[PDB]
Structure 1
């Protein structure tokens, strides 16, 4: 299946070259899989989710995404027009306030929730978690994402927008989860994107058009925009039975466009998430 005039990031993860506009994907489109969007919430009422989004837990007074960041990343995961896995289930876990900030105790509690809450859901194709967030290095945040990963959840996290080595940032530095860096529409590393040995993959993360709060759209940037591209891909590749939750980070790296990225500092992988769809 094809989506014409797609967002550049959608077209990128279906191409071996930048500059294209069509997103080529398998029609199953992540049906039967779930992606937990651990963020500021989701505006599930957005017509771009078609009722496939729902809030499952908040850590604040409302489950309303009064920020927009979470609705954006849920959109990049599985929105109709701006998403990778266009048929996936979306579960919102509001751990970030409407300012997009959140304490470590709340973020860890959110990952522990998803680890157990997934046993209440029907995700036959497997469970994915997209963690577009992160602060300074913490062993407690790192071990939480490892716990979530170990429990059978494909955990994808942002490398961080500090333009430094990601080793000093959590959950980015947790070795067992998929740390996602950001590139731009010209196959360069994003100006802001973190790097390092811990990074496992790069995703489209500069000028990402996706859903926003108020039924609108918005184009923003960040490794927080690249992470849902990879989370949606992993959910897509799991519906196809191409990989599993424990392997999906390795599979996506094994099948990524190697070497296309420029300005990748020495020691960081040079891989761009790629669904390898052949009509």
Structure 2
């Protein structure tokens, strides 16, 4: 399948070079996989989700995404126009408030919720969790992310936007999950992206167009935008049978575009998520 005039990040995921505009991908499109977006919620009614999104848990007064961030991230995972895995099932877990903030106890509870809830959902091709969030180092947050991964979920987490070593941020610093840095359309490390030995992969994160609340769209930037490209890629590859929740991060690193990015500090991977789609 081919999507012409796609958002640059989707085109980048399916190319060995920057500057292309078509997103090439297998038509299976993540069908049969499930991605939990642990964030501010998901506006499931957005036409771009096509009935494939639903809220399954909220830690706040409402399940509504009153911010937009979670809807944007969910759109990069799996919306029709803006998503990597255009036929996946999306599940929203609202651990962040409508200002985009959340206590670590709540974020932890949301991870534990997913580890359990997935046993009640039909996800034959596997389960992914996308965590476009984090703050300072916390062993408890890292342990929660490690538990979620160990339970059989492909966990993708943002590296953080501090232009610093991700070792000091959580859940970014948990080694066992897939820690995602951000790049721009010219294959530079995004200005704000964290780096360091704990990063597993980079994905598109600067100027990413996706869904927003009120049935709208907008472009924003962050390691929060890179993360769902990797989560969606994992779901897509799991549907194709190429990898599993336990092995997807490693598989994505194995098959990434290597050495393409600039301003990568020595000791940080120079690996950019790539679907290796061959029509």
Give the TM-score of the pair, scaled to structure 2: 1.00
Cα deviation, residue 130, structure 1: 0.2
SS of the residue aligned with 2:128? strand
- The one-character-per-residue Cα deviations of 1:170-229 (angstroms, maximum 9, x if unpaired) are 000000000000000000000000000000000000000000000000100000000000
Tell me the CA shift for residue 237 of structure 1: 0.1
Partner Cα distance (2:189, 2:195) in 1:
9
Q: Deviations over 1:23-74 (max 9, x none)?
A: 0000000000000000000000000000000000000000000000000000
- What's the secondary structure of 2:251's corresponding residue? helix
Cα distance in 2 between the residues matched to 1:278 and 1:215: 34
After superposition, where does 1:147-162 map in structure 2 within 5 Å?
147-162=147-162
**Which position in structure 2 is the counterpart of 1:80?**
80
Measure, in 2, the Cα distance between the counterparts of 1:167 and 1:251: 22
Tell me how many residue pairs correspond in the alignment. Answer: 279
Structure 2 residue 90 is matched with structure 1 residue 114: no
Mapped to 2, the partners of 1:219 and 1:103 lie a distance apart of 26
Residue 236 of structure 1: how far off its partner (Å) = 0.2
1:84-141, CA deviations, whole angstroms, 9 ceiling, x for partnerless residues? 0000000000000000000000000000000000001000000000000000000000
3-state DSSP of counterpart to 1:225: helix
Instruction: Give the aligned partner of residue 131 of structure 1.
Output: 131
CA distance in structure 2 between the aligned counterparts of 1:123 and 1:218, rounded to whole angstroms: 30
Residue aligning to 2:140: 140
Q: Name structure 1 gaps, 5 residues minimum.
A: none
In the aligned structure 1, how far is the partner of 2:258 from the partner of 2:278? 18
Q: Is residue 2:161 matched to residue 1:167?
A: no
Q: 1:12-51 residue pairs with structure 2 within 5 A?
A: 12-51=12-51
Deviation at 1:265, TM superposition (A): 0.3
* CA deviation after TM superposition for structure 1 residue 244, in Å: 0.3
Give the whole-Å Cα distance in 2 for the aligned partners of 1:242 and 1:37: 22
Q: CA deviation at 1:247?
A: 0.2
Query: Which residue is equivalent to 2:221?
Result: 221
Matched residues in 2 for 1:254 and 1:101: separation? 34
Deviation at 1:248, TM superposition (A): 0.2
CA RMSD, 1 decimal: 0.2
Distance (whole Å) between structure 1 residues aligned to residue 247 and residue 125 of structure 2: 14
Instruction: Quote how far apart the aligned CAs of 1:166 are.
Output: 0.2
In the TM superposition, what is the alpha-carbon distance from 1:230 to its structure 2 partner?
0.2
